[PDB]
Structure 1
Amino acid sequence: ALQTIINARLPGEEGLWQIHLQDGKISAIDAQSGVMPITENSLDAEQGLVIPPFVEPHIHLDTTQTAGQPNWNQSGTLFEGIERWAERKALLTHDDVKQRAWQTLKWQIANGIQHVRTHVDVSDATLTALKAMLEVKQEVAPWIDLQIVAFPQEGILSYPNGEALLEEALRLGADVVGAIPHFEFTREYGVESLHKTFALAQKYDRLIDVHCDEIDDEQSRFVETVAALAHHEGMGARVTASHTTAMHSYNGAYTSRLFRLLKMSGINFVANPLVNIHLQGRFDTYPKRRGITRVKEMLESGINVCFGHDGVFDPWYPLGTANMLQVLHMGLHVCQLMGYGQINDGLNLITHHSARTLNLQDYGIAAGNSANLIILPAENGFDALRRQVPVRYSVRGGKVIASTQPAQTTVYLEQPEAIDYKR
């Protein structure tokens, strides 16, 4: 079994490092003064970057892989997506959900993602997708720690037996309580739904992840209730507000007042760049707003924010290969986090910040932690992002669970020349 990871670069650290492994855990981390020779039981990072696993804090594995079945969304609109999904009703079965979820999960494993939080629609009396996902969670456990959010897609108070179904999902094992206040019939139902969500989270000792203010409505401010209730219960770490795209449209004065509460509350924020740029701003003509939450300001204020892919190859987001560096690339551009350091530190948005969002207790390259880490064939975060590098090796429990042999490009000039896109 692997005993050491050598010649590793670490974000924010100078030089090369050696990571000693023992019994599936990291036993020690020592600096090197030069390049170490490879040997049996040693995985050579070859001066590449070693980081804890990529994390997917927000994805919908119950709808993934269905784009084009039976028809494609030609307009690319949310409205048509709903219609196209409805046309696939007959195919939505236990086995179908498991098959599609597993397909995307395999892409995630290949992409060095070892932690995934999937929302699952529980506005379904049969709870078909949930029962399927609970089995998938057990099956994929050796490679990915999957969290399931009981997501009341049609509302808690605005859907028949919505609250009862949400609680049933928790009784069946869902890890996180979801909500969607801006989709409830009224602002009052929205606020009330959050009180019910928090009550359930405290009753069952579960995390919370709200689809919060995902709308270009400057009056959608459910985020303040999410943060206030978290602060009141002293449970910020266990709470997440997903999307908050409405924040992109708030006036600056309210946002400034709100930020004090956001920081004090300690709650987490998830932005989903690929989907947000696609679905937001659809009611604008020109100019058209970007519609992503205030990521840059959150980072400047020390508020934990991270990036999710949200949808993969489905009616609402037709693209994706479940690649976090791709999600990061889009987020850095749309959020204008384009300074060298901002780009280089970008990896935090798809690693450490996301681990905090999932309230992970065993994450990071540190002595005592499980030997879960990935190797990127790049010098630093900037380089990894610029070249959209694959994951050379993914290690879990001290064992390699995925590897990618990089593409080899050659140009035939007066003589053949290898091209690696580095200067």
Structure 2
Amino acid sequence: MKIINARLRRQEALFTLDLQDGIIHRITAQAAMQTADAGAIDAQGRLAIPPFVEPHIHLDATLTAGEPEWNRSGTLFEGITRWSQRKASITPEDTRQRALKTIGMLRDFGVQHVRTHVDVTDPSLAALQALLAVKQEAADLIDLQIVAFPQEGIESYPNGRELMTRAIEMGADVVGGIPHYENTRDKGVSSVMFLMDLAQRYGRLVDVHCDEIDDPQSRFLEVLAEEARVRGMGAQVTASHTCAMGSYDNAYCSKLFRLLKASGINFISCPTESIHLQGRFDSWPKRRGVTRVAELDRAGINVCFAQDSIQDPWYPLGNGNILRILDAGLHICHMLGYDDLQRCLDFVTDNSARALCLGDNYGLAEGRPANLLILDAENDYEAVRRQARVLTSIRHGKVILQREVEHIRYPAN
């Protein structure tokens, strides 16, 4: 299949992309606009990018907001209580139906790579069973990674170490954790030691809910980064949230950055989720509660944005559109400078792909899989400013989604 008149990120020239056998066969700069022969897609000067990535979402909990009760306080902790209640009625088929519906939303907005956390603090591991099957069933739309996520703690929940182990042995791709939620500081530390041992023993990736709390004493990130560094696993390890970093002592944080850089770990921020869940224990002034995204990025540290929740016990909105999350993140993290906006798509594509260790299975380069979108915009700035629609989504060389370009009529002239 041929795509002509396509823009590529941060370049002026138009390109033709030749897709064959499910991979990108050739990419070639054109002289100017050209005409689509039969069986050629004309991108019409629109941007072609690799697919959006959703590197952190809770598909087991998606679409359960209000069941059986609402999170009245809007806090992380009440959300956990509400989820605990909903867990009483989770079945594999219930999980499957909700997850597939949310996957449809992600697909509608150009997401082809998803990393989902699944709560394994449930002796039945019902949601895990369902999502391991969804991974197979939904492969025509997405590549799904599954994180074994001990929502109620590893050290603090009955048989927590055993449940994490079962989940990894069943084939969860990523080992999770929640050290700030363990009952004591010492158990928070030992949970990190366990999960890293587990990840290393089974050769899995790591993605830990790390310091998702406004307490400036929540410093489990240093433990994770140092284990990553010592074990030589940096690239395989992601720290999600790190909200407490947004409240750290600045002298400590400056020291910390040396280790963060040295460890080579990745960071995920969920700005719409954290703006909603953080700052709840302040009066006024009210902190933003988001990690230091701009600063990590300027230090050469890989950071990206994620939606986290869609209509679940923690977050009542969500429609699958990662560009809305990008917009929120640039605002809250003070990244609306000219240079930030010229490359802002990094934070929902390339950086996220690096966090998920997609390697050569991602990106527009000859020889890589033919997975791409055509966006209704010419560049990064216009993409975020207009919240550009995904006009075409192509997966394994096939068109899986097509939108018409919006047309507004003015009947009164």
1:227 aligns with 2:229: no
User: Deviation per CA, 1:363-400, whole angstroms, max 9, x where unpaired?
Assistant: 10001100011110101111011111221001011101
Among 286, 289, 309, the alignment partner of 1:288 is: 286
**SS of aligned partner of 1:314:** coil
CA distance in structure 2 between the aligned counterparts of 1:265 and 1:178, rounded to whole angstroms: 18
Q: How many angstroms does 1:86 deviate by?
A: 4.8
Q: Which stretch of the first structure deviates more once superposed, 74-83 or 383-392? A: 74-83
Give runs of aligned pairs for residues 45-56 of structure 1, distance below 5 A: 45-56=43-54
Match of 2:153 in 1: 155
Give runs of aligned pairs for residues 212-291 of structure 1, distance below 5 A: 212-291=210-289
TM-score scaled by length of structure 2: 0.97
- Change in Cα spacing, 1:356 to 1:184, as seen in structure 2 (3 Å) is same
Q: CA RMSD in A?
A: 1.4
User: Which letter does structure 2 place at the counterpart of 1:221?
Assistant: R
Match of 1:421 in 2: none
Match of 1:30 in 2: 28
Q: How many angstroms does 1:332 deviate by?
A: 0.4
Among 96, 99, 104, the alignment partner of 1:98 is: 96
**SS of aligned partner of 1:45:** strand
**SS of aligned partner of 1:348:** helix
CA distance in structure 1 between the aligned counterparts of 2:36 and 2:191, rounded to whole angstroms: 57
- Aligned residue pair count: 412
Q: How many angstroms does 1:92 deviate by?
A: 1.5
Q: How many angstroms does 1:53 deviate by?
A: 0.4
* Structure 1: 5+ residue stretches without partners: 416-423
User: Deviation per CA, 1:122-159, whole angstroms, max 9, x where unpaired?
Assistant: 01111011001101011011210000000011111111
Q: Does structure 1 conserve the Cα–Cα contact (< 8 Å) formed by 2:214 and 2:279? A: yes
Q: How many angstroms does 1:165 deviate by?
A: 0.5
- Change in Cα spacing, 1:180 to 1:87, as seen in structure 2 (3 Å) is closer
Q: How many angstroms does 1:239 deviate by?
A: 0.2
CA distance in structure 2 between the aligned counterparts of 1:405 and 1:298, rounded to whole angstroms: 38
Match of 1:418 in 2: none
CA distance in structure 1 between the aligned counterparts of 2:355 and 2:341, rounded to whole angstroms: 21
Q: How many angstroms does 1:87 deviate by?
A: 4.9
User: Deviation per CA, 1:12-67, whole angstroms, max 9, x where unpaired?
Assistant: 21221111111111112110110021122212211111100000000000000112
CA distance in structure 1 between the aligned counterparts of 2:72 and 2:227, rounded to whole angstroms: 41
Give runs of aligned pairs for residues 284-323 of structure 1, distance below 5 A: 284-323=282-321
- Change in Cα spacing, 1:90 to 1:202, as seen in structure 2 (3 Å) is closer
Q: Does structure 2 conserve the Cα–Cα contact (< 8 Å) formed by 1:5 and 1:45? A: yes
- Change in Cα spacing, 1:83 to 1:331, as seen in structure 2 (3 Å) is same
Match of 2:180 in 1: 182
User: Deviation per CA, 1:89-110, whole angstroms, max 9, x where unpaired?
Assistant: 5541110000000000011111
Q: Does structure 1 conserve the Cα–Cα contact (< 8 Å) formed by 2:10 and 2:342? A: no
**Identity percentage over the alignment?**
57
Among 100, 111, 114, the alignment partner of 2:112 is: 114
- Change in Cα spacing, 1:68 to 1:112, as seen in structure 2 (3 Å) is same
**SS of aligned partner of 1:386:** helix
Q: Does structure 1 conserve the Cα–Cα contact (< 8 Å) formed by 2:239 and 2:267? A: yes
Match of 1:420 in 2: none
CA distance in structure 2 between the aligned counterparts of 1:191 and 1:73, rounded to whole angstroms: 29
Q: Does structure 1 conserve the Cα–Cα contact (< 8 Å) formed by 2:58 and 2:117? A: yes
CA distance in structure 2 between the aligned counterparts of 1:146 and 1:374, rounded to whole angstroms: 18
User: Deviation per CA, 1:264-316, whole angstroms, max 9, x where unpaired?
Assistant: 11100000011010001110000000011010001111100001100001121
Q: How many angstroms does 1:76 deviate by?
A: 3.4
TM-score scaled by length of structure 1: 0.95
Q: Does structure 1 conserve the Cα–Cα contact (< 8 Å) formed by 2:75 and 2:278? A: no
User: Which letter does structure 1 place at the counterpart of 2:131?
Assistant: M
**SS of aligned partner of 2:18:** strand
- Change in Cα spacing, 1:90 to 1:233, as seen in structure 2 (3 Å) is closer
CA distance in structure 1 between the aligned counterparts of 2:78 and 2:215, rounded to whole angstroms: 21
Match of 1:333 in 2: 331
CA distance in structure 2 between the aligned counterparts of 1:61 and 1:103, rounded to whole angstroms: 10
Q: How many angstroms does 1:341 deviate by?
A: 2.2
Q: Does structure 2 conserve the Cα–Cα contact (< 8 Å) formed by 1:110 and 1:403? A: no
CA distance in structure 1 between the aligned counterparts of 2:405 and 2:82, rounded to whole angstroms: 37
**SS of aligned partner of 2:410:** strand
Match of 2:395 in 1: 396
